[PDB]
Design a protein around this ligand. Structure first.
Ligand SMILES: N[C@H](COc1cncc(-c2ccc3[nH]ncc3c2)c1)CC1=C2C=CC=CC2N=C1
Lengths: 20, 336
């Protein structure tokens, strides 16, 4: 399930903003 | 609406043209606990001795702001924040600076980040997501009416106050702009195609972000995610999005238009403006007036055992606040 793929991905924590 | 804005724009303009400076000093605050950190600064819970009030203090390292070339952005944040005023924007109480740092003292939101409740609960019901989206919809109508572009909408920047209503934080990328802008900024999962392809964009990038938010709030995950940024950008520009089977038909329809890679057809940036969003089916049940007044029933009321409680916030190492004996970046930040 996508929910499972998300939860297992390295992107479930606080996401940093980007710029340079 | 137009009656309201007009007057609001007049109060903003006055402050915008004559921003207040140095309205406090560090020694008038009691350091209590770091509530977040990162980039070039941190945010601490703090107590004001005169009033006994608690505030969230954002301390930015002047020298680090310069290494990351965020001087103008930083000046943008304070100048804009001291001049705006809306129920869903966190209030900037005081601002000042010393030899080493810039300081922005704001109203403390004990409730914590939406991100936290969202991740803990998994996903919000549609009536719950709609209630939060509506608040964002109005904040963007307010902001955009003032020529302001927010640029970093996400669960991590939305706090829940005592009444269960959202309070937007972090104006690090906010900017008053009439016309096209080009700065590359934001958070990966939320970047409009316009930004990633670096082709000059406008307010429309905010509306696209609202679309990512609603999807994430309702689904439990971003419509575009992957381990490395590049992978995520390929998805955003593909013009392909999938909706969980539980998303209502109107919800799917609303998002199709919001996550429209074709910024000349994407709701919000159309001829009818925000009304293409406010008059959408998924919103028919929404009393837009009621929400602004906060008289609508909040779907969730966070809990706190008292003022100064930080249980809704994670823990971070406590470094020390050092102010050099020499002024560090005077000229670069003279207007702050
Ligand atoms: N975006 C996240 C959150 O940011 C914020 C920024 N600026 C004020 C707030 C805030 C404002 C008001 C408020 N009342 N209670 C808590 C509270 C918090 C949050 C993390 C991130 C950073 C934290 C620190 C520095 C730079 C950062 N860059 C990203």
């Amino acid at each position: 399930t996508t929910y499972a793929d998300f939860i297992a991905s390295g992107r479930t924590g606080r996401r940093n903003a980007i710029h340079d | 609406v137009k009656e309201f804005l007009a007057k609001a724009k007049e109060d903003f303009l006055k402050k915008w043209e004559n921003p207040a400076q140095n309205t406090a000093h560090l020694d008038q605050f009691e350091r209590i606990k770091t509530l977040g950190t990162g980039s070039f600064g941190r945010v601490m819970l703090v107590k004001h001795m005169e009033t006994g009030n608690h505030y969230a203090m954002k301390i930015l390292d002047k020298q680090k702001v310069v290494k990351l070339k965020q001087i103008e952005h930083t000046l943008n944040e304070k100048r804009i924040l001291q001049a705006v005023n809306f129920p869903f924007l966190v209030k900037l109480e005081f601002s000042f600076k010393d030899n080493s740092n810039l300081y922005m003292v704001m109203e403390y939101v004990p409730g914590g980040e939406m991100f936290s409740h969202l991740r803990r609960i998994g996903r919000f019901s549609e009536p719950h997501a709609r209630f939060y989206a509506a608040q964002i919809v109005l904040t963007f109508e307010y902001l955009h009416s003032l020529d302001l572009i927010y640029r970093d909408l996400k669960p991590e920047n939305l706090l829940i106050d005592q009444q269960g209503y959202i309070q937007v934080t972090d104006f690090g990328f906010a900017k008053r702009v009439k016309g096209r802008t080009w700065t590359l900024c934001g958070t990966p999962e939320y970047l409009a195609p316009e930004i990633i392809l670096s082709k000059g964009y406008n307010k429309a990038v905010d509306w696209w972000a609202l679309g990512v938010l609603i999807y994430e709030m309702a689904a439990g995950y971003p419509p575009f995610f992957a381990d490395q940024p590049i992978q995520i950008y390929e998805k955003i520009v593909s013009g392909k999005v999938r909706f969980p089977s539980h998303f209502s038909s109107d919800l799917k329809d609303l998002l199709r238009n919001l996550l429209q890679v074709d910024l000349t057809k994407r709701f919000g940036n159309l001829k009818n403006g925000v009304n293409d969003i406010k008059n959408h089916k998924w919103f028919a049940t929404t009393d837009w007036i009621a929400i602004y007044q906060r008289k609508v029933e909040a779907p969730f009321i966070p809990k706190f055992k008292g003022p100064g409680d930080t249980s809704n916030f994670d823990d971070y190492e406590e470094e020390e606040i050092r102010v050099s004996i020499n002024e560090k970046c005077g000229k670069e930040f003279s207007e702050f």
